Amino acid sequence: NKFSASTVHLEHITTALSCLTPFGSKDDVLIFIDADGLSFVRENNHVIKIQLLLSRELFMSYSYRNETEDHMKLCVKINHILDSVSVMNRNSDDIVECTLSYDGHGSPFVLIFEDSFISERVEYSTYLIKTNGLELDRERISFEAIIKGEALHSALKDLKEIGCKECYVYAKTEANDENVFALISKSQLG
Amino acid sequence: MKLKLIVNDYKLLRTTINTVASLRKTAILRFNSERLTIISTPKSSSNNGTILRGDTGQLWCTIPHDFRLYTVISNTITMECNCDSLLSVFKRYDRVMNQSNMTIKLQPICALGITFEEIMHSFKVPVKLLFRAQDTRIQEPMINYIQLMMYKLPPISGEFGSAFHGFIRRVERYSNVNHIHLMGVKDVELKIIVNELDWHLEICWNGPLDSVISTHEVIIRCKDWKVCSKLYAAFEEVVLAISHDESCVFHCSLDERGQIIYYIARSKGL
């Protein structure tokens, strides 16, 4: 098996999958396999792209015995994976050891769920590959802000509740410690 | 034609009574002078036995009476009545005991004089007297043993019984399941494969399984697996026989022996 990864903290991969849902829910997903870790890439309408990464440290076993190529790319649909794991999480309270596997080009993406009594095995069909051009230039940053997660989540929820057909962002730091960062919205309220 | 008895083993008879009703309408009660053979088979049932239904599975369960008395005078009597009336009667008796013994009698069309008390309850369920020539056409299927392999399923009361029951019913959580493709490899590993979804699902069992006595495969329907699951839930000694692309037989027993045999034919070709 050119790639094999095992874990029992399935909540992490579950959050990885639920963080990939906003970028459409029935489309193709790119999975990049390299020695450093496991990464999912999604792109929508050539205007926005997400890139989650599961590091090697999240799996006890991470072989990557592939030697001909440094990185492996496969394309699988997300609706299949979502519909499978949805019914697999019915008894998620059991001690489940997920096992990812991939034997190379032309082979399906395997996802084995073993509960020490039942070993469910799923082989996801891999599709042809149509995702980096959408990357900011590291030598041209105009503003760099570090914000807490809860505050940003609350602001985004508020903007959703206001509708927010269009959005604006501000980044001004005046002479003193006057760091101004705002999220203006063009909504029904005005 | 004198048939009288007071059946009180109760679970053994009840599971047959329920499974014949769940299988198809009406049932055959072969009252020998030694052994009772409840035969719910499609050959003897005049409403699309295999016309577009595909209902081919035949059950041959034998119930002993040693249930208080077995006076079968004639001495093989073979009957046929609907399962709804006897289901209701048995349910009423079960509830009554939940709150005496039910006497059973016989009156080519007759009636069954079921009578029990707490109140007085009389139920004259209609029945018939299917002929000896028709009885001879009711013969149990013959199953070869050249490739037939059997899997000693674990008892439900054991530690692994609940896990095996859950694994068996695991195929019921997908509503788009029609055909189940059983697999058995030789310590034997028993596997269930589903190939009717957008993803290839294989439900395996890595627990301990005993093979009383080459991959044998058989594709059956989902309802047959439901009744197999119900039988496994209601029995301890359960043997799964798998004929390679011929048939699947579910052998249950209760320790002469009240064996229950379900013969399921392939619903597809490997």
Side-chain angles (χ1 to χ4, degrees):
Chain A
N1 248 10
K2 290 188 182 62
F3 157 73
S4 32
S6 180
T7 167
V8 312
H9 272 304
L10 269 69
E11 316 316 290
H12 290 150
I13 204 192
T14 288
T15 50
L17 225 61
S18 30
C19 286
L20 278 168
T21 297
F23 281 53
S25 155
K26 309 79 199 173
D27 217 65
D28 189 19
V29 156
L30 301 101
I31 312 173
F32 283 60
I33 316 306
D34 53 275
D36 304 314
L38 186 103
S39 46
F40 305 92
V41 190
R42 290 203 70 177
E43 195 135 0
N44 304 68
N45 306 356
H46 277 131
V47 298
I48 190 176
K49 175 201 63 51
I50 207 173
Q51 181 170 321
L52 289 81
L53 170 63
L54 303 189
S55 268
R56 190 186 342 144
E57 286 67 272
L58 247 176
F59 312 104
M60 314 72 138
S61 322
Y62 192 99
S63 301
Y64 200 99
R65 318 137 191 210
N66 182 74
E67 196 102 78
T68 62
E69 191 93 44
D70 64 330
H71 80 289
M72 274 187 305
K73 297 157 45 66
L74 56 141
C75 258
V76 303
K77 301 294 188 187
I78 189 69
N79 40 351
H80 301 165
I81 303 191
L82 288 174
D83 289 344
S84 76
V85 193
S86 305
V87 273
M88 314 225 171
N89 251 4
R90 228 287 182 274
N91 44 9
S92 180
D93 52 342
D94 303 37
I95 316 298
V96 179
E97 164 161 300
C98 179
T99 313
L100 311 187
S101 325
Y102 190 63
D103 321 353
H105 204 46
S107 301
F109 196 59
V110 202
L111 187 125
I112 314 113
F113 273 21
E114 39 254 62
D115 306 357
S116 86
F117 297 127
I118 309 75
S119 155
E120 312 216 359
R121 176 186 170 99
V122 178
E123 319 164 8
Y124 298 105
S125 315
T126 301
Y127 298 91
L128 225 66
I129 35 176
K130 316 317 300 297
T131 54
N132 209 156
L134 193 40
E135 182 61 34
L136 88 175
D137 201 10
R138 144 78 189 72
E139 321 101 22
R140 200 89 47 231
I141 296 95
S142 307
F143 101 97
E144 185 163 344
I146 301 181
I147 321 107
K148 208 50 70 161
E150 285 222 89
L152 191 57
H153 179 77
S154 63
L156 290 174
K157 267 230 163 262
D158 257 296
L159 281 207
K160 218 218 313 176
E161 278 115 27
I162 309 150
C164 182
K165 263 120 91 163
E166 315 153 7
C167 164
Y168 255 116
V169 74
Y170 205 75
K172 192 179 65 182
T173 206
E174 320 190 10
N176 209 351
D177 189 7
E178 329 269 352
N179 319 328
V180 200
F181 187 85
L183 288 171
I184 270 163
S185 86
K186 164 42 57 179
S187 46
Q188 69 187 18
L189 272 56
Chain B
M1 56 180 333
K2 197 255 200 73
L3 178 59
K4 183 186 185 306
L5 65 160
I6 314 182
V7 298
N8 194 195
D9 56 356
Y10 189 78
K11 172 56 151 28
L12 173 283
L13 187 120
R14 172 233 191 210
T15 201
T16 78
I17 262 62
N18 313 134
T19 197
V20 299
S22 66
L23 258 174
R24 65 192 46 88
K25 275 133 82 73
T26 84
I28 297 182
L29 310 102
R30 176 173 305 178
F31 281 92
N32 197 5
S33 193
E34 53 186 2
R35 65 186 83 180
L36 168 59
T37 315
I38 307 265
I39 303 168
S40 177
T41 69
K43 289 181 199 262
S44 174
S45 183
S46 60
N47 297 344
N48 304 252
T50 63
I51 317 171
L52 286 140
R53 297 211 196 307
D55 305 348
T56 294
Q58 8 184 350
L59 182 95
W60 294 74
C61 55
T62 304
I63 307 176
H65 292 76
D66 184 11
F67 211 97
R68 295 170 44 181
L69 62 104
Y70 202 66
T71 165
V72 182
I73 292 206
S74 175
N75 289 251
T76 312
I77 318 310
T78 47
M79 264 45 45
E80 201 245 345
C81 69
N82 53 33
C83 308
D84 212 346
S85 296
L86 52 87
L87 253 282
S88 295
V89 158
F90 282 116
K91 287 189 215 83
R92 289 197 59 169
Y93 187 77
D94 257 313
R95 183 185 64 258
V96 155
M97 94 73 68
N98 286 350
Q99 290 151 7
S100 177
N101 291 339
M102 36 162 46
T103 301
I104 315 176
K105 285 193 67 175
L106 181 52
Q107 281 71 94
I109 297 182
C110 304
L112 297 173
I114 270 67
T115 60
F116 66 87
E117 282 168 348
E118 314 250 349
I119 309 165
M120 317 93 183
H121 327 269
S122 299
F123 311 100
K124 300 179 188 301
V125 175
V127 80
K128 82 182 311 305
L129 270 181
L130 84 90
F131 299 87
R132 171 196 172 188
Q134 305 179 348
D135 182 27
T136 320
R137 310 160 223 173
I138 302 160
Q139 58 277 325
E140 105 169 300
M142 98 151 63
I143 316 281
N144 46 55
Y145 290 114
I146 173 170
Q147 295 183 354
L148 179 49
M149 66 175 307
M150 299 72 64
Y151 318 84
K152 182 32 195 151
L153 304 199
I156 190 93
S157 302
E159 162 69 21
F160 334 103
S162 56
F164 201 81
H165 182 118
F167 154 81
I168 289 314
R169 305 218 339 270
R170 189 78 50 252
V171 307
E172 305 181 1
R173 63 176 51 180
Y174 325 109
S175 177
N176 295 105
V177 164
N178 280 347
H179 290 19
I180 289 162
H181 165 272
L182 299 177
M183 179 83 116
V185 80
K186 175 182 177 57
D187 290 348
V188 291
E189 148 163 34
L190 170 136
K191 177 193 292 95
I192 293 175
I193 309 181
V194 166
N195 234 325
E196 76 256 3
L197 306 166
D198 267 45
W199 47 98
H200 184 97
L201 176 59
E202 302 184 13
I203 311 102
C204 325
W205 170 265
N206 45 69
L209 213 43
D210 303 349
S211 179
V212 77
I213 194 80
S214 177
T215 88
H216 288 91
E217 269 168 290
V218 48
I219 301 186
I220 67 163
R221 266 153 70 253
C222 182
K223 250 300 293 183
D224 302 339
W225 206 237
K226 201 283 280 143
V227 281
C228 283
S229 149
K230 187 90 210 274
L231 284 180
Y232 174 88
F235 277 105
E236 321 81 271
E237 286 208 319
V238 177
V239 181
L240 175 55
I242 281 191
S243 304
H244 184 65
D245 197 13
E246 312 276 70
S247 210
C248 190
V249 198
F250 216 66
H251 197 319
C252 317
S253 154
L254 184 99
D255 308 4
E256 177 66 32
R257 246 149 197 167
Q259 52 165 4
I260 290 197
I261 320 183
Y262 186 1
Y263 309 92
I264 307 158
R266 34 168 285 182
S267 301
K268 196 208 295 297
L270 311 182

mmCIF file with all atom_site columns, all heavy atoms in Angstrom, chain A residues 136 140-147 169-172 181:
data_model
loop_
_atom_site.group_PDB
_atom_site.id
_atom_site.type_symbol
_atom_site.label_atom_id
_atom_site.label_alt_id
_atom_site.label_comp_id
_atom_site.label_asym_id
_atom_site.label_entity_id
_atom_site.label_seq_id
_atom_site.pdbx_PDB_ins_code
_atom_site.Cartn_x
_atom_site.Cartn_y
_atom_site.Cartn_z
_atom_site.occupancy
_atom_site.B_iso_or_equiv
_atom_site.pdbx_formal_charge
_atom_site.auth_seq_id
_atom_site.auth_comp_id
_atom_site.auth_asym_id
_atom_site.auth_atom_id
_atom_site.pdbx_PDB_model_num
ATOM 1   N N   . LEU A 1 136 ? -1.637  34.224 -2.446 1.00 0.00 ? 136 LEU A N   1
ATOM 2   C CA  . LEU A 1 136 ? -1.158  35.592 -2.325 1.00 0.00 ? 136 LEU A CA  1
ATOM 3   C C   . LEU A 1 136 ? 0.357   35.641 -2.479 1.00 0.00 ? 136 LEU A C   1
ATOM 4   O O   . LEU A 1 136 ? 1.071   34.693 -2.141 1.00 0.00 ? 136 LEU A O   1
ATOM 5   C CB  . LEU A 1 136 ? -1.572  36.187 -0.978 1.00 0.00 ? 136 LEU A CB  1
ATOM 6   C CG  . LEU A 1 136 ? -0.664  35.984 0.243  1.00 0.00 ? 136 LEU A CG  1
ATOM 7   C CD1 . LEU A 1 136 ? -1.232  36.767 1.423  1.00 0.00 ? 136 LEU A CD1 1
ATOM 8   C CD2 . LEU A 1 136 ? -0.443  34.512 0.605  1.00 0.00 ? 136 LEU A CD2 1
ATOM 9   N N   . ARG A 1 140 ? 4.250   41.097 -1.052 1.00 0.00 ? 140 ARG A N   1
ATOM 10  C CA  . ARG A 1 140 ? 3.383   42.197 -1.454 1.00 0.00 ? 140 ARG A CA  1
ATOM 11  C C   . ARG A 1 140 ? 2.252   42.439 -0.454 1.00 0.00 ? 140 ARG A C   1
ATOM 12  O O   . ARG A 1 140 ? 1.247   43.065 -0.809 1.00 0.00 ? 140 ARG A O   1
ATOM 13  C CB  . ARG A 1 140 ? 2.815   41.908 -2.846 1.00 0.00 ? 140 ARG A CB  1
ATOM 14  C CG  . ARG A 1 140 ? 2.294   43.120 -3.599 1.00 0.00 ? 140 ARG A CG  1
ATOM 15  C CD  . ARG A 1 140 ? 3.352   43.825 -4.441 1.00 0.00 ? 140 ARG A CD  1
ATOM 16  N NE  . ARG A 1 140 ? 4.152   42.905 -5.242 1.00 0.00 ? 140 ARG A NE  1
ATOM 17  C CZ  . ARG A 1 140 ? 5.479   42.885 -5.284 1.00 0.00 ? 140 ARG A CZ  1
ATOM 18  N NH1 . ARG A 1 140 ? 6.211   43.739 -4.586 1.00 0.00 ? 140 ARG A NH1 1
ATOM 19  N NH2 . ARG A 1 140 ? 6.090   41.987 -6.051 1.00 0.00 ? 140 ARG A NH2 1
ATOM 20  N N   . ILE A 1 141 ? 2.396   41.976 0.788  1.00 0.00 ? 141 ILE A N   1
ATOM 21  C CA  . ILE A 1 141 ? 1.312   42.078 1.758  1.00 0.00 ? 141 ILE A CA  1
ATOM 22  C C   . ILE A 1 141 ? 1.083   43.541 2.112  1.00 0.00 ? 141 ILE A C   1
ATOM 23  O O   . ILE A 1 141 ? 2.026   44.273 2.441  1.00 0.00 ? 141 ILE A O   1
ATOM 24  C CB  . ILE A 1 141 ? 1.633   41.245 3.007  1.00 0.00 ? 141 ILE A CB  1
ATOM 25  C CG1 . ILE A 1 141 ? 1.711   39.760 2.648  1.00 0.00 ? 141 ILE A CG1 1
ATOM 26  C CG2 . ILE A 1 141 ? 0.585   41.466 4.095  1.00 0.00 ? 141 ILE A CG2 1
ATOM 27  C CD1 . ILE A 1 141 ? 3.112   39.270 2.371  1.00 0.00 ? 141 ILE A CD1 1
ATOM 28  N N   . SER A 1 142 ? -0.176  43.971 2.053  1.00 0.00 ? 142 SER A N   1
ATOM 29  C CA  . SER A 1 142 ? -0.536  45.338 2.405  1.00 0.00 ? 142 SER A CA  1
ATOM 30  C C   . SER A 1 142 ? -1.005  45.468 3.846  1.00 0.00 ? 142 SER A C   1
ATOM 31  O O   . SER A 1 142 ? -0.913  46.557 4.422  1.00 0.00 ? 142 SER A O   1
ATOM 32  C CB  . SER A 1 142 ? -1.632  45.851 1.469  1.00 0.00 ? 142 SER A CB  1
ATOM 33  O OG  . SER A 1 142 ? -1.262  45.686 0.113  1.00 0.00 ? 142 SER A OG  1
ATOM 34  N N   . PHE A 1 143 ? -1.511  44.389 4.439  1.00 0.00 ? 143 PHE A N   1
ATOM 35  C CA  . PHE A 1 143 ? -1.916  44.407 5.835  1.00 0.00 ? 143 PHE A CA  1
ATOM 36  C C   . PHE A 1 143 ? -1.862  42.989 6.382  1.00 0.00 ? 143 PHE A C   1
ATOM 37  O O   . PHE A 1 143 ? -2.113  42.020 5.662  1.00 0.00 ? 143 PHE A O   1
ATOM 38  C CB  . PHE A 1 143 ? -3.318  45.005 6.005  1.00 0.00 ? 143 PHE A CB  1
ATOM 39  C CG  . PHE A 1 143 ? -4.396  43.981 6.184  1.00 0.00 ? 143 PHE A CG  1
ATOM 40  C CD1 . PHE A 1 143 ? -4.843  43.642 7.448  1.00 0.00 ? 143 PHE A CD1 1
ATOM 41  C CD2 . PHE A 1 143 ? -4.973  43.367 5.087  1.00 0.00 ? 143 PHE A CD2 1
ATOM 42  C CE1 . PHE A 1 143 ? -5.838  42.702 7.615  1.00 0.00 ? 143 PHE A CE1 1
ATOM 43  C CE2 . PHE A 1 143 ? -5.968  42.428 5.247  1.00 0.00 ? 143 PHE A CE2 1
ATOM 44  C CZ  . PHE A 1 143 ? -6.403  42.096 6.513  1.00 0.00 ? 143 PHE A CZ  1
ATOM 45  N N   . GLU A 1 144 ? -1.525  42.880 7.666  1.00 0.00 ? 144 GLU A N   1
ATOM 46  C CA  . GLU A 1 144 ? -1.389  41.590 8.338  1.00 0.00 ? 144 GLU A CA  1
ATOM 47  C C   . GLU A 1 144 ? -2.007  41.714 9.722  1.00 0.00 ? 144 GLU A C   1
ATOM 48  O O   . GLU A 1 144 ? -1.436  42.366 10.601 1.00 0.00 ? 144 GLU A O   1
ATOM 49  C CB  . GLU A 1 144 ? 0.076   41.169 8.431  1.00 0.00 ? 144 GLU A CB  1
ATOM 50  C CG  . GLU A 1 144 ? 0.281   39.781 9.005  1.00 0.00 ? 144 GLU A CG  1
ATOM 51  C CD  . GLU A 1 144 ? 1.662   39.224 8.718  1.00 0.00 ? 144 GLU A CD  1
ATOM 52  O OE1 . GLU A 1 144 ? 2.355   39.769 7.833  1.00 0.00 ? 144 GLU A OE1 1
ATOM 53  O OE2 . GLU A 1 144 ? 2.055   38.239 9.376  1.00 0.00 ? 144 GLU A OE2 1
ATOM 54  N N   . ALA A 1 145 ? -3.164  41.089 9.918  1.00 0.00 ? 145 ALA A N   1
ATOM 55  C CA  . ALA A 1 145 ? -3.899  41.169 11.170 1.00 0.00 ? 145 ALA A CA  1
ATOM 56  C C   . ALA A 1 145 ? -4.048  39.783 11.778 1.00 0.00 ? 145 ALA A C   1
ATOM 57  O O   . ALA A 1 145 ? -4.360  38.817 11.076 1.00 0.00 ? 145 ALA A O   1
ATOM 58  C CB  . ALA A 1 145 ? -5.279  41.793 10.956 1.00 0.00 ? 145 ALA A CB  1
ATOM 59  N N   . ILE A 1 146 ? -3.822  39.692 13.086 1.00 0.00 ? 146 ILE A N   1
ATOM 60  C CA  . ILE A 1 146 ? -4.025  38.467 13.851 1.00 0.00 ? 146 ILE A CA  1
ATOM 61  C C   . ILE A 1 146 ? -5.211  38.700 14.776 1.00 0.00 ? 146 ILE A C   1
ATOM 62  O O   . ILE A 1 146 ? -5.162  39.576 15.648 1.00 0.00 ? 146 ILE A O   1
ATOM 63  C CB  . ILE A 1 146 ? -2.767  38.074 14.640 1.00 0.00 ? 146 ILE A CB  1
ATOM 64  C CG1 . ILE A 1 146 ? -1.591  37.883 13.677 1.00 0.00 ? 146 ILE A CG1 1
ATOM 65  C CG2 . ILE A 1 146 ? -3.019  36.805 15.449 1.00 0.00 ? 146 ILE A CG2 1
ATOM 66  C CD1 . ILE A 1 146 ? -0.298  37.460 14.339 1.00 0.00 ? 146 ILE A CD1 1
ATOM 67  N N   . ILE A 1 147 ? -6.271  37.918 14.590 1.00 0.00 ? 147 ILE A N   1
ATOM 68  C CA  . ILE A 1 147 ? -7.525  38.115 15.303 1.00 0.00 ? 147 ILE A CA  1
ATOM 69  C C   . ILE A 1 147 ? -7.902  36.824 16.012 1.00 0.00 ? 147 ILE A C   1
ATOM 70  O O   . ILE A 1 147 ? -7.578  35.723 15.555 1.00 0.00 ? 147 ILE A O   1
ATOM 71  C CB  . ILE A 1 147 ? -8.664  38.557 14.355 1.00 0.00 ? 147 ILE A CB  1
ATOM 72  C CG1 . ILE A 1 147 ? -8.149  39.535 13.293 1.00 0.00 ? 147 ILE A CG1 1
ATOM 73  C CG2 . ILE A 1 147 ? -9.796  39.194 15.144 1.00 0.00 ? 147 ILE A CG2 1
ATOM 74  C CD1 . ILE A 1 147 ? -8.033  38.926 11.910 1.00 0.00 ? 147 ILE A CD1 1
ATOM 75  N N   . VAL A 1 169 ? -13.610 45.314 4.255  1.00 0.00 ? 169 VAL A N   1
ATOM 76  C CA  . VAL A 1 169 ? -12.637 45.150 5.328  1.00 0.00 ? 169 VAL A CA  1
ATOM 77  C C   . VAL A 1 169 ? -11.747 46.383 5.373  1.00 0.00 ? 169 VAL A C   1
ATOM 78  O O   . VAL A 1 169 ? -11.394 46.945 4.332  1.00 0.00 ? 169 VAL A O   1
ATOM 79  C CB  . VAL A 1 169 ? -11.788 43.871 5.149  1.00 0.00 ? 169 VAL A CB  1
ATOM 80  C CG1 . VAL A 1 169 ? -10.765 44.039 4.032  1.00 0.00 ? 169 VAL A CG1 1
ATOM 81  C CG2 . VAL A 1 169 ? -11.100 43.505 6.458  1.00 0.00 ? 169 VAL A CG2 1
ATOM 82  N N   . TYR A 1 170 ? -11.387 46.803 6.583  1.00 0.00 ? 170 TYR A N   1
ATOM 83  C CA  . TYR A 1 170 ? -10.535 47.963 6.806  1.00 0.00 ? 170 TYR A CA  1
ATOM 84  C C   . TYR A 1 170 ? -9.295  47.558 7.584  1.00 0.00 ? 170 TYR A C   1
ATOM 85  O O   . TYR A 1 170 ? -9.353  46.689 8.459  1.00 0.00 ? 170 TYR A O   1
ATOM 86  C CB  . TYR A 1 170 ? -11.280 49.041 7.577  1.00 0.00 ? 170 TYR A CB  1
ATOM 87  C CG  . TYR A 1 170 ? -10.775 50.452 7.361  1.00 0.00 ? 170 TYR A CG  1
ATOM 88  C CD1 . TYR A 1 170 ? -11.059 51.136 6.192  1.00 0.00 ? 170 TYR A CD1 1
ATOM 89  C CD2 . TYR A 1 170 ? -10.063 51.118 8.352  1.00 0.00 ? 170 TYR A CD2 1
ATOM 90  C CE1 . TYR A 1 170 ? -10.632 52.432 6.002  1.00 0.00 ? 170 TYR A CE1 1
ATOM 91  C CE2 . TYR A 1 170 ? -9.634  52.415 8.167  1.00 0.00 ? 170 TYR A CE2 1
ATOM 92  C CZ  . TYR A 1 170 ? -9.922  53.066 6.989  1.00 0.00 ? 170 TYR A CZ  1
ATOM 93  O OH  . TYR A 1 170 ? -9.495  54.357 6.786  1.00 0.00 ? 170 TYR A OH  1
ATOM 94  N N   . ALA A 1 171 ? -8.177  48.208 7.271  1.00 0.00 ? 171 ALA A N   1
ATOM 95  C CA  . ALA A 1 171 ? -6.921  47.937 7.966  1.00 0.00 ? 171 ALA A CA  1
ATOM 96  C C   . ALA A 1 171 ? -6.125  49.242 7.996  1.00 0.00 ? 171 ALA A C   1
ATOM 97  O O   . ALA A 1 171 ? -5.405  49.567 7.050  1.00 0.00 ? 171 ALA A O   1
ATOM 98  C CB  . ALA A 1 171 ? -6.149  46.818 7.286  1.00 0.00 ? 171 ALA A CB  1
ATOM 99  N N   . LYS A 1 172 ? -6.269  49.983 9.093  1.00 0.00 ? 172 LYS A N   1
ATOM 100 C CA  . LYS A 1 172 ? -5.546  51.230 9.301  1.00 0.00 ? 172 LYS A CA  1
ATOM 101 C C   . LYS A 1 172 ? -4.948  51.228 10.698 1.00 0.00 ? 172 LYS A C   1
ATOM 102 O O   . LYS A 1 172 ? -5.638  50.910 11.672 1.00 0.00 ? 172 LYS A O   1
ATOM 103 C CB  . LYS A 1 172 ? -6.463  52.446 9.125  1.00 0.00 ? 172 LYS A CB  1
ATOM 104 C CG  . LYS A 1 172 ? -5.720  53.775 9.051  1.00 0.00 ? 172 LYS A CG  1
ATOM 105 C CD  . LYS A 1 172 ? -6.661  54.959 8.855  1.00 0.00 ? 172 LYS A CD  1
ATOM 106 C CE  . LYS A 1 172 ? -7.583  55.169 10.051 1.00 0.00 ? 172 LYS A CE  1
ATOM 107 N NZ  . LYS A 1 172 ? -8.530  56.299 9.839  1.00 0.00 ? 172 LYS A NZ  1
ATOM 108 N N   . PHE A 1 181 ? -9.513  47.881 12.755 1.00 0.00 ? 181 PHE A N   1
ATOM 109 C CA  . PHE A 1 181 ? -9.880  46.773 11.881 1.00 0.00 ? 181 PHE A CA  1
ATOM 110 C C   . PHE A 1 181 ? -11.387 46.602 11.956 1.00 0.00 ? 181 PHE A C   1
ATOM 111 O O   . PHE A 1 181 ? -11.930 46.359 13.039 1.00 0.00 ? 181 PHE A O   1
ATOM 112 C CB  . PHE A 1 181 ? -9.164  45.483 12.292 1.00 0.00 ? 181 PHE A CB  1
ATOM 113 C CG  . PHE A 1 181 ? -9.364  44.346 11.334 1.00 0.00 ? 181 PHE A CG  1
ATOM 114 C CD1 . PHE A 1 181 ? -8.554  44.207 10.221 1.00 0.00 ? 181 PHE A CD1 1
ATOM 115 C CD2 . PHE A 1 181 ? -10.356 43.409 11.552 1.00 0.00 ? 181 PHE A CD2 1
ATOM 116 C CE1 . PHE A 1 181 ? -8.738  43.161 9.342  1.00 0.00 ? 181 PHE A CE1 1
ATOM 117 C CE2 . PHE A 1 181 ? -10.543 42.361 10.678 1.00 0.00 ? 181 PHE A CE2 1
ATOM 118 C CZ  . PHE A 1 181 ? -9.733  42.236 9.572  1.00 0.00 ? 181 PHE A CZ  1
#
